[PDB]
Symmetry: C2
Subunit: 358 residues, 2 copies
Amino acid sequence: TPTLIRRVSIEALDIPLHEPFGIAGGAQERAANLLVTVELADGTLGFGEAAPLPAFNGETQDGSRAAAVSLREAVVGSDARAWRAVARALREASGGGAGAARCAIETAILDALTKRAGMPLWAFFGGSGTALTTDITITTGSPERAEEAARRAAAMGFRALKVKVGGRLAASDPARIEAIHAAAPGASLILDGNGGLTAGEALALVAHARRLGADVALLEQPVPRDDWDGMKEVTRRAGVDVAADESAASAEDVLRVAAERAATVVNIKLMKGGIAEALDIAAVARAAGLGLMIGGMVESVLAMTASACFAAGLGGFSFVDLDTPLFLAENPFDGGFVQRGPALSLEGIRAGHGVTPQ
Amino acid sequence: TTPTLIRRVSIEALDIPLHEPFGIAGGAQERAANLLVTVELADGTLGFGEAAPLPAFNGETQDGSRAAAVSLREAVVGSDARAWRAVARALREASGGGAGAARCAIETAILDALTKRAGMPLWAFFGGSGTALTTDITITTGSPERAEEAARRAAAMGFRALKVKVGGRLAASDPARIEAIHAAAPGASLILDGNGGLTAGEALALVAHARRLGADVALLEQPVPRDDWDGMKEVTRRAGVDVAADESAASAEDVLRVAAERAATVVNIKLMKGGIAEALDIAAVARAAGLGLMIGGMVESVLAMTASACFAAGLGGFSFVDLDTPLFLAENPFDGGFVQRGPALSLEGIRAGHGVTPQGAENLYF
């Protein structure tokens, strides 16, 4: 059987970070990710990315590697056509953990499966469209640096801006939103708390934004997941859409998020629990009445093209937050999406997710 | 020219004789009055689908479905088969969520063409969790004698699960019907299917009867009508066995509600109620909500049935398989599909699409 999985290889994917559009970078961070290569018995190669992020859920580069080395056995000798069974077997074999290693494996599998079929991964997911419009992140920091980044972004076509708020440097938030809004007044704002706010603090921030004139399109995970009360409060009161990220870790979370009104939008990420889980979270969310958002960790072109294919294929996504390749200094890959400012195009992808290592 | 654009959709009569009429709660089908939909791609790939509307189930007819497909042609012809979800979304919107059987035919024919030209079996497309299923078989309305008979024949062929139709014109039969069945197939699990032609009162009593005869009633299926939500709730609470929503679970939305209201513990998913896209969403909401999954159908040939088996076996996770209508048809106008060995359905020989091919047509180009 030409689809049996023959080998799973794992190597470093260390990709330097820079600030988009020229600006002064600083101390030089790197995205410490992994490239997973799945090889079928007929020689087909599929490709996936593990982008673990410690600050999001404690997963790490070496930990993901050790994870995939372990899962390797449970995958080798299985049929790639049995993709959902393998994803199940991966889940059982990791105790439900190690979401980024499993994501890399499932992506590599589906990439191999669809590319040998002559099929684009966007079509596999449904091909509702091939075009997305992404937001771009305004990196935390000065009121004056946020001004300049809002300015540059607007200059390259970006009309939707995701602004990190709270936590470290939170006293500056009001000034930041001031400067960003005055710099890019035509621009839409996503206020992303990453669980860093009290309910009261997030309300005051939205209220200040709107009194300025800013179109606040969305308030993202303002309070921590365990603050169900804060999530319900903010959703009830904000008068804008509120997104669950941490509060939407499973399909069972989105039923709860729906039934309690803890948010109106779900941020879905492939890296969190893999493609099988993410496909279920999206159907439950759409059934339950909530808006759909596609996101990611700090991902190269490979993992983001994959997310793009999922979102474009499934259709019906209101928010797209897939800007991470703009923050990368190098690109070790051929193919993938085509970007024109916020405009993302998958028209050109004809086989799997179309990304291949140079 | 893009190979996967839809150049032509045909629709033709698919009339297959039933040996005996297929009796449900107030409804007999004496012919399967279905349609065959053929989608042809620009590269020449043919994809095949089946509309099996069942008037007695939800009011769709052969001719209603035929006219609906024709009205929908523009949402289909000239569209890319790679965009199957956009096509289903556009059929669903131009239909208002009606015309389920026509929409299933079309999405089935598109997916069939998309996968076959790609050399991908449909069960693989759906997830490939397995390639084998075990079907129940149905003991349809009539005397308590032709049921006694039917139950022994099924038990001998290997059927460990029996679905007994109940209610309607002949509901005095049911209590004895179930006696004659348990005695003849003592190893057999039972599904009592009401097709909404009962009250709660009856449903619960009819269970209780069966329970104390020693019968393993494994499921009570939709005993009350679709908009008796209180009755579904009551039977789910007091029955003591699993309850399936069928008529009450036509959208993923209904399934969320069925879960939250505790109106069933099981969902009967059919490709034909709302098409394949609707069905994918319902399966996910159903496992999310903790509901068991049942894969069922209308009165379908080998074509729509194999599509369903590819769906259920690809997805994995199904507790009930009720895919037994080809057993009731006096002919099989198709080659390929699942291989059947009594209750056993095998999909291993399906190499591309659903593997089914046929052995005046409405013809639609542009």
